[PDB]
mmCIF file of C-alpha atoms in Angstrom:
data_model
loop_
_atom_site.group_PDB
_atom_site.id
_atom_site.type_symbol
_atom_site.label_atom_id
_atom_site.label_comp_id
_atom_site.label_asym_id
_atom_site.label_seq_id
_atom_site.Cartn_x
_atom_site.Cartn_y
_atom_site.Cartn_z
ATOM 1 C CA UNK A 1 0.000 0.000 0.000
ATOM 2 C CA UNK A 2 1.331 3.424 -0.792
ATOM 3 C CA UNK A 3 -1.405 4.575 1.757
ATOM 4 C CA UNK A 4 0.907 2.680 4.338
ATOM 5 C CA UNK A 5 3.792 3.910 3.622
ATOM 6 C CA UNK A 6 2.972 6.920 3.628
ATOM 7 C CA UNK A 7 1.676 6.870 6.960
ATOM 8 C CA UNK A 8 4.566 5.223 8.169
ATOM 9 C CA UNK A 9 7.061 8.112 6.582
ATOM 10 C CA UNK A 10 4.912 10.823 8.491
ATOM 11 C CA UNK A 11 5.040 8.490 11.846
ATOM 12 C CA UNK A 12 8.848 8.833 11.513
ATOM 13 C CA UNK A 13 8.762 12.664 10.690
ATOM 14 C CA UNK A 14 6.866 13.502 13.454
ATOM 15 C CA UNK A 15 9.022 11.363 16.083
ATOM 16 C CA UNK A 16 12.153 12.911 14.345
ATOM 17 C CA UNK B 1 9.894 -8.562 18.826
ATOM 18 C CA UNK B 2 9.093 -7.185 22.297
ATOM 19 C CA UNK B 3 11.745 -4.731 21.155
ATOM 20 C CA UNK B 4 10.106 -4.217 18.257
ATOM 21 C CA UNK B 5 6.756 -3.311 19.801
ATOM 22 C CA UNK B 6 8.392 -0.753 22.513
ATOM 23 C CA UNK B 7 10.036 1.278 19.340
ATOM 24 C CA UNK B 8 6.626 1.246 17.629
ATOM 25 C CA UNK B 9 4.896 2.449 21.054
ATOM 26 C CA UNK B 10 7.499 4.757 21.104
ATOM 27 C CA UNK B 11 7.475 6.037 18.008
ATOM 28 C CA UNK B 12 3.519 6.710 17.972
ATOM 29 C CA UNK B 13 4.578 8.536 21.315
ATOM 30 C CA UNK B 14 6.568 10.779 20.059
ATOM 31 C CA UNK B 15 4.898 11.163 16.716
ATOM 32 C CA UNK B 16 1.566 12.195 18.892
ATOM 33 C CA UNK C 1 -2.241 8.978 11.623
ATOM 34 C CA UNK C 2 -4.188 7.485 14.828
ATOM 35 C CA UNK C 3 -5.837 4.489 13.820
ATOM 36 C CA UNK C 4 -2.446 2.829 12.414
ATOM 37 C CA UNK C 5 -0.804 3.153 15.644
ATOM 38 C CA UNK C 6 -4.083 2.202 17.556
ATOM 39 C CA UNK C 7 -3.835 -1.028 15.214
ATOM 40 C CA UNK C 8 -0.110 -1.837 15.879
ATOM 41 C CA UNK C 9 -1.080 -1.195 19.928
ATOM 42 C CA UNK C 10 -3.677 -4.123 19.304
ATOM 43 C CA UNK C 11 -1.696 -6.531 17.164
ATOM 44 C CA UNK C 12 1.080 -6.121 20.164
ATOM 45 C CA UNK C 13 -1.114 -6.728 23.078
ATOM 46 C CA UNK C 14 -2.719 -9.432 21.455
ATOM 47 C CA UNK C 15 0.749 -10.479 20.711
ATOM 48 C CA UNK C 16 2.181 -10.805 24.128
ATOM 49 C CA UNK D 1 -5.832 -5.785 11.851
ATOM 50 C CA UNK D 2 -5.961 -8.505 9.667
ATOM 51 C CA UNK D 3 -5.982 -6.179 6.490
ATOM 52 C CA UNK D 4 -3.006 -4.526 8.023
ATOM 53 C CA UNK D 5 -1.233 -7.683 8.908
ATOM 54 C CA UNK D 6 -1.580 -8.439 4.900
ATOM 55 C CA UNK D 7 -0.596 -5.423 3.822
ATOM 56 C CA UNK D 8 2.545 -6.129 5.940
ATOM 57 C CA UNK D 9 3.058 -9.701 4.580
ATOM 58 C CA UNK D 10 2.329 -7.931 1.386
ATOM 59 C CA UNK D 11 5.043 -5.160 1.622
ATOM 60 C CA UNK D 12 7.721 -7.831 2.865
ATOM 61 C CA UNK D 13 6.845 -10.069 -0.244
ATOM 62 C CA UNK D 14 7.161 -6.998 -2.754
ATOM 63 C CA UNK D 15 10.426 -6.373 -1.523
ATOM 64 C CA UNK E 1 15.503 -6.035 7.402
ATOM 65 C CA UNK E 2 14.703 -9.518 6.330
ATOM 66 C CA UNK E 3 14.522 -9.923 10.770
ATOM 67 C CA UNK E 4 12.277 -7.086 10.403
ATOM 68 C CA UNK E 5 10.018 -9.364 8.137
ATOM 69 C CA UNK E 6 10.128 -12.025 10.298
ATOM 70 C CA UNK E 7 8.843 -10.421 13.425
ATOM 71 C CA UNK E 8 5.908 -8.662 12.096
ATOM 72 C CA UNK E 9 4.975 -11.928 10.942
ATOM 73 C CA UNK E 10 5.641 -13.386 14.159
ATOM 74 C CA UNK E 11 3.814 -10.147 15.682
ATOM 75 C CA UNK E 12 0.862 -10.964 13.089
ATOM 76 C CA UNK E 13 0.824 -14.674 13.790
ATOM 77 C CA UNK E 14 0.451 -14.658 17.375
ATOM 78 C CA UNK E 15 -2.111 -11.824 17.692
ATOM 79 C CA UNK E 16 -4.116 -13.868 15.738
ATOM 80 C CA UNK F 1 14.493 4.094 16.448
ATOM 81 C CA UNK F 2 15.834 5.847 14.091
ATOM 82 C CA UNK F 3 17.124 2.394 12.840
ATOM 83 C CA UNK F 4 13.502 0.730 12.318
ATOM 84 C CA UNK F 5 12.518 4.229 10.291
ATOM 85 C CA UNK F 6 15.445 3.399 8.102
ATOM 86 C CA UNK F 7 14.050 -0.262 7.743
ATOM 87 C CA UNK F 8 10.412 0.813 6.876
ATOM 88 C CA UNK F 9 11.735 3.598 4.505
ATOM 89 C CA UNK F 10 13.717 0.670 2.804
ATOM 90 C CA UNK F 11 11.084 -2.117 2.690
ATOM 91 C CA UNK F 12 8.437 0.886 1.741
ATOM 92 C CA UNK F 13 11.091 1.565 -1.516
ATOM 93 C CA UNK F 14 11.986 -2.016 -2.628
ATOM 94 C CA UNK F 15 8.275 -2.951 -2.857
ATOM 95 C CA UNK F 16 7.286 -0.074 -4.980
#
């Protein structure tokens, strides 16, 4: 899923 | 994998 | 997004 | 959660 | 990265 | 932490 992913890049962006 | 979970809880944590 | 970590907080407590 | 948990076995397979 | 693999589908198969 | 982002970003750009 692209959806996913992008979800998880924000996840990281937000804890960084 | 009960690593793994803790750096996902943590991860949400920070990214809330 | 909420519901993704809400999901992974389920799959690990069901998990463990 | 089980949708998720394919999408996961689904990610690891298309990589 | 292939461990990663492994433990969400170890995280998957035992929440199930 | 920072280590499992690196993962995801990975697994998220070999599958697509």
């Amino acid at each position: 899923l692209k959806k996913l992913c992008k979800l998880l890049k924000k996840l990281c962006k937000l804890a960084g």
